[PDB]
């Protein structure tokens, strides 16, 4: 289909003793496939999907080297940023980094990104042109001048347009049985009386993949948002996702209300009614 590869990195300083906590995870679409945790025993990049286990020792050696290199860069950054912001050595602080690439249905490059945050706020990010930088404040502006002088965007662009896309295609082929399979939502409706004259109708979407989905309620054929509740999409724990939407209705009028489900795995949207 249309696809993405993304890596996520978090480093948290520990001022009382020792090095920061460092956690890295890699995804293809909504499927985690590698991880590194500085608290874990292996001290290696580890597989988390079957289709990555076939990569050879050179793969795992190189990804371990690179992810440890990311970890030490973040360790340095935490010290540098404490200085840029004139902060004490007493408190814990956080660096986060996300980067990756999107490809279309034809597996051609669509866009790339690289975003960096300090203490949960934008710090510096690569613009969509893959040449320029967005600096949120004057500390990040110092970083921007440094990365300009060192040609960083050039080699990041080369990675995002090349290596990133090329290995994404490789993973998509090796894991095609799941990564290129859509799991349409399994849907049903429940009914929960709230009094002797009104009731909650809850529309369920279960066991679907990928995570993107839209659930909407209609009354007599027109969208309704009054008296509705929509929960955040949530992981089932087996690689699929769940969501529900509910509406409160006068008892006996349930047939006016329809739940509409849109998902990449559905050729046409589904309609559900209570009966």
């Amino acid at each position: 289909g249309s696809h993405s590869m993304r890596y996520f990195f978090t480093s948290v300083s520990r001022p009382g003793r020792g090095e920061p906590r460092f956690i890295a995870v890699g995804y293809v679409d909504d499927t985690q496939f590698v991880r590194f945790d500085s608290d874990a025993a292996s001290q290696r990049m580890e597989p988390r999907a079957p289709w990555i286990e076939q990569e050879g020792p050179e793969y795992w050696d190189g990804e371990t080297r690179k992810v440890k290199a990311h970890s030490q860069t973040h360790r340095v950054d935490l010290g540098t940023l404490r200085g840029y912001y004139n902060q004490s050595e007493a408190g814990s602080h956080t660096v986060q980094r996300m980067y990756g690439c999107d490809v279309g249905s034809d597996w051609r490059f669509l866009r790339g990104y690289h975003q960096y945050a300090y203490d949960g706020k934008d710090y510096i990010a690569l613009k969509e042109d893959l040449r320029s930088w967005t600096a949120a404040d004057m500390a990040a502006q110092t970083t921007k001048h440094k990365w300009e002088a060192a040609h960083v965007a050039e080699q990041l662009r080369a990675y995002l347009e090349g290596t990133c896309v090329e290995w994404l295609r490789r993973y998509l082929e090796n894991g095609k049985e799941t990564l290129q399979r859509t799991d349409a939502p399994k849907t049903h409706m429940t009914h929960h009386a709230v009094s002797d004259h009104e009731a909650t109708l809850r529309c369920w979407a279960l066991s679907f993949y990928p995570a993107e989905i839209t659930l909407t309620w209609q009354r007599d054929g027109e969208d309704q948002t009054q008296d509705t509740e929509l929960v955040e999409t949530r992981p089932a724990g087996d690689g699929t996702f769940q969501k529900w939407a509910a509406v409160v209705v006068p008892s006996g009028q349930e047939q006016r209300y329809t739940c509409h489900v849109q998902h990449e795995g559905l050729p046409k949207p589904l309609t559900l009614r209570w009966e």
Binding site: K66, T80, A140, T143, K146, L156, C164
Partner: peptide, 9 residues
């Protein structure tokens, strides 16, 4: 595959 060239801020 990871990027091989992150630079410090």
């Amino acid at each position: 595959l990871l990027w091989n060239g992150p630079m410090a801020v």
